[PDB]
Design an enzyme around this catalytic site. Structure first.
Site, PDB file in Angstrom:
ATOM      1  CD  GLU A  82      33.248 110.120  35.034  1.00 20.44           C
ATOM      2  OE1 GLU A  82      33.730 108.711  34.923  1.00 20.44           O
ATOM      3  OE2 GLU A  82      32.582 109.522  36.775  1.00 20.44           O
ATOM      4  CG  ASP A 127      45.634  96.697  34.884  1.00 24.24           C
ATOM      5  OD1 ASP A 127      47.205  96.343  34.088  1.00 24.24           O
ATOM      6  OD2 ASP A 127      45.354  97.427  33.977  1.00 24.24           O
TER       7      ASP A 127
HETATM    8  N1  LIG Z   1      35.948 105.905  30.814  1.00 18.73           N
HETATM    9  C1  LIG Z   1      35.793 105.673  29.867  1.00 18.73           C
HETATM   10  N2  LIG Z   1      35.384 106.547  28.586  1.00 18.73           N
HETATM   11  C2  LIG Z   1      36.108 106.298  27.887  1.00 18.73           C
HETATM   12  N3  LIG Z   1      36.512 104.977  26.746  1.00 18.73           N
HETATM   13  C3  LIG Z   1      36.511 104.699  27.640  1.00 18.73           C
HETATM   14  C4  LIG Z   1      36.691 104.859  29.455  1.00 18.73           C
HETATM   15  N4  LIG Z   1      37.536 103.538  29.755  1.00 18.73           N
HETATM   16  C5  LIG Z   1      37.278 101.788  28.352  1.00 18.73           C
HETATM   17  N5  LIG Z   1      37.792 103.767  27.625  1.00 18.73           N
HETATM   18  C6  LIG Z   1      38.007 103.203  26.151  1.00 18.73           C
HETATM   19  O1  LIG Z   1      37.577 101.732  26.018  1.00 18.73           O
HETATM   20  C7  LIG Z   1      39.437 100.828  25.446  1.00 18.73           C
HETATM   21  C8  LIG Z   1      39.254  99.767  26.509  1.00 18.73           C
HETATM   22  O2  LIG Z   1      39.465  99.901  27.377  1.00 18.73           O
HETATM   23  P1  LIG Z   1      39.167  98.891  29.034  1.00 18.73           P
HETATM   24  O3  LIG Z   1      37.500  97.923  28.325  1.00 18.73           O
HETATM   25  O4  LIG Z   1      39.162  99.246  30.317  1.00 18.73           O
HETATM   26  O5  LIG Z   1      40.284  98.227  28.572  1.00 18.73           O
HETATM   27  P2  LIG Z   1      42.214  99.726  28.807  1.00 18.73           P
HETATM   28  O6  LIG Z   1      42.396  98.429  29.942  1.00 18.73           O
HETATM   29  O7  LIG Z   1      42.712  98.839  27.807  1.00 18.73           O
HETATM   30  O8  LIG Z   1      41.050 100.420  28.716  1.00 18.73           O
HETATM   31  C9  LIG Z   1      40.002 101.931  25.826  1.00 18.73           C
HETATM   32  O9  LIG Z   1      41.079 102.478  25.106  1.00 18.73           O
HETATM   33  C10 LIG Z   1      39.343 103.552  25.661  1.00 18.73           C
HETATM   34  O10 LIG Z   1      39.296 104.338  24.611  1.00 18.73           O
HETATM   35 MG   LIG Z   2      41.575  99.392  31.429  1.00 15.31          MG
END
Ligand SMILES: Nc1ncnc2c1ncn2[C@@H]1O[C@H](COP(=O)(O)OP(=O)(O)O)[C@@H](O)[C@H]1O
Ligand SMILES: [Mg+2]
Ligand SMILES: Nc1ncnc2c1ncn2[C@@H]1O[C@H](COP(=O)(O)OP(=O)(O)O)[C@@H](O)[C@H]1O
Ligand SMILES: *Cc1cc(-c2ccc3c(c2)OCCN3C)cc(OC)c1O
Ligand SMILES: [Mg+2]
Lengths: 385, 384
Positions: A82, A127
């Site tokens: 989402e 996490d």
């Molecule tokens: N479901 C999501 N919807 C919108 N943005 C997301 C979502 N999941 C992660 N992000 C964005 O992507 C970035 C990296 O997410 P991810 O790759 O899981 O590493 P993190 O452990 O920082 O969440 C985060 O800063 C967040 O802003």
């Molecule tokens: Mg993450």
């Protein structure tokens, strides 16, 4: 320059942000809705389709984000989630990201609850951090909610977790590592950005040491006293000392103002017609003088003190008497003089914040001493089993 | 000036269109999807939750729209459905409409497959019409799709909409939908017209049994087959109308490759059969008319120049026109380049080369070869 492999489609130029170890997140599509899509190296991160299926097949809890569908490209893996407006870190770091519109403590009740749902189905997050607590986009009336994302995936010897939030015993897993992480986030939120360990670079170190701070919590505020008491048990270096995910929800730290007041009136009733020699009454003024502040008639407003003197019948060293008087004034409130009504009121909010403002340790104490009656019929909403 | 009635939501200014009986449709929201909301006065229209739930409980057909959820206002009913870019009305009529990535025959096909699906669940539409066949918005790689909507609703205050109503419902089963379908079929194919065929007099002439089908030349193949099927679909006797899935097996839909393949399989099947045989006899029943007297004289000069060397070719005999078809197609590689270029490339241009000149050839063979309906080869061609 779009891509398909879909199922999920997207465009590589709409990058939401980079994740851990290669993993990157762009903004894609699905049915025809905007969605956040996350590409992961199968060599690095191991999805558990089993757990997530137990999630889908189970009833939706509104604080655990949903995984739309999974796709395994030959070299990759692709996941759809989402498109949330921001992660917790945005909410915490720029106050004006426009909540607008969403309380910190309720955010914590949601987070902790979604977590309870996860722990329910014997799944551990492993996490938890502000980056994995995402805030949705405005609903129908413009309300915002909190959901835990990026749960269920892991690392395959590329330590699970994220530097800064890793429970200490996991360095040298059950629910306690998630509780500990959560404790760090409660403090992250309440304190508007600080961490209990507390600066980024020495963070994991101090965790492994046992160095806390909680310097944000004065010991003259009711609110701060309760928050401290909860977080301490949450980040306890002995993982057995850590509250159950639901035990956290039940704690005072969340209670409505109405709930607190009710607790004071309910104690005042249950300890009534009960002798002084008894276990309860004996225990309740164990701290006595300290919480009451020597004479409690002496710390309050003039009108109230004036009215009270006319009954006493009222100690001033007994917590039990302050509670009886609270319950009493609350009960006869409408037929009380206008002077007092203005000094106390409204109700329950200002009425209960009146007494906890002037006796920071009142609730904390009463609740502690009244632990004796946890199993009773009336006190189930207050305590855990 | 927003509305609510959770979980749906919309700005009343963003209207999409007015409907029957005060029913209105707006652009609003659901999860975070844009979505069309249709408010109905529960006093005029009854929603059938049972049907729709059966649709959810079955596997999703791609040309059947999805009812997301329903909510009851204290005085209304709200219904949320996939926002679509237009109605078949637009598809047909607005000159500069991009019906991108979507031929008409495949649209009618998608429609009729959706109908087969709905009939399969024993749910009858009862109001099939251009406004109730919608066009999607471009998916991932741009492709447009069509789906049927406003099914499962009915009227309480006679079902159907004026101009698409089966006659015998006036004097319900799946036959009504097949009929209305026939109507929209012609409508799409005729690029605007109606079988009955002008708005005011439409319903009247349908009662009278007056048809039209004027856009259907008798010298062009396409027209002949489309006609062949539409006529059966818009029969006045609802017992004549072919089942939704039956309409599918029909020639009208076949890729040219399939067409040519049908001529080949037929040519092969008939070979080594007595010319007195009931099947061969039946194939030649229409004879003369369909081969245009001497089909050898009705083909390009090079091809007849090359066919003169063999014959063996009767020229008044569909069996032989079809055999020349099979045989030239087979030995295509060795044929002179002149013949190659008057004919090729296979299948499209080739099968076109014959159906062009003998418009009725396909129709006729299809009808006559209904005698081999049950055979295992001829199941892709026919309805068992
Ligand atoms: N479901 C999501 N919807 C919108 N943005 C997301 C979502 N999941 C992660 N992000 C964005 O992507 C970035 C990296 O997410 P991810 O790759 O899981 O590493 P993190 O452990 O920082 O969440 C985060 O800063 C967040 O802003
Ligand atoms: Mg993450
Ligand atoms: N899913 C949709 N998306 C966009 N417009 C729609 C949709 N469904 C219906 N409409 C519009 O609303 C109009 C009226 O629809 P409705 O009230 O269902 O009556 P009818 O379908 O008989 O026209 C249609 O002509 C169409 O333009
Ligand atoms: C604060 C307080 C007030 C009263 C109280 C008793 C009786 C009456 C009353 C107030 O007002 C309306 C009617 N009425 C006779 C009693 C108290 O002690 C139980 C206390 O503490
Ligand atoms: Mg419609």
């Amino acid at each position: 320059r779009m891509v398909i492999v879909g199922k999920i489609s997207f465009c590589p130029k709409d990058v939401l942000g980079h994740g851990a170890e290669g993993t990157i997140v762009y903004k894609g599509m699905f049915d025809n809705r905007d969605v956040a899509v996350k590409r992961i190296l199968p060599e690095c991160f191991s999805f558990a389709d089993r757990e997530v299926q137990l999630l889908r097949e189970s009833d939706e809890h509104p604080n655990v984000i949903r995984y739309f569908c999974t796709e395994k490209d030959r070299q990759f893996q692709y996941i759809a989630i989402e498109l949330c407006a921001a992660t917790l870190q945005e909410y915490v770091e720029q106050k004006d990201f426009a909540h607008l519109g969403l309380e910190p403590i309720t955010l914590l009740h949601q987070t902790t609850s979604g977590l309870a749902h996860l722990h329910s189905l014997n799944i551990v997050h492993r996490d938890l951090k502000p980056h994995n607590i995402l805030l949705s986009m405005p609903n129908a009336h413009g309300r915002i909610k909190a959901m835990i994302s990026d749960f269920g995936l892991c690392k395959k010897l590329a330590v699970p977790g994220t530097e800064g939030w890793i429970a200490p015993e996991m360095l040298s897993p059950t629910y306690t590592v998630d509780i500990f992480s959560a404790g760090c986030v409660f403090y992250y939120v309440i304190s508007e950005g600080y961490h209990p360990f507390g600066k980024s670079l020495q963070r994991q170190a101090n965790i492994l040491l046992g160095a806390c701070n909680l310097d944000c919590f004065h010991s003259d505020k009711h609110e701060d006293v309760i928050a401290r008491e909860l977080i301490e048990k949450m980040i306890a270096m002995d993982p057995q000392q850590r509250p159950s995910a639901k035990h956290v929800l039940k704690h005072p730290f969340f209670w409505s103002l109405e709930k607190q007041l009710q607790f004071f009136q309910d104690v005042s009733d249950r300890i009534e017609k009960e002798a002084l020699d008894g276990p309860i009454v004996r225990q309740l003024e164990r701290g006595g003088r300290a919480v009451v502040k020597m004479d409690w008639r002496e710390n309050i407003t003039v009108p109230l003190q004036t009215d009270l003197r006319k009954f006493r019948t009222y100690k001033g060293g007994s917590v039990r008497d302050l509670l009886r008087a609270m319950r009493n004034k609350k009960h006869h409130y409408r037929e009380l003089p206008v002077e007092v009504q203005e000094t106390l009121g409204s109700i329950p909010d200002d009425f209960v914040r009146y007494f906890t403002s002037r006796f920071p340790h009142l609730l904390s104490h009463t609740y502690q001493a009244m632990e004796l009656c946890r199993h009773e019929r009336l006190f189930q909403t207050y305590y855990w089993h």
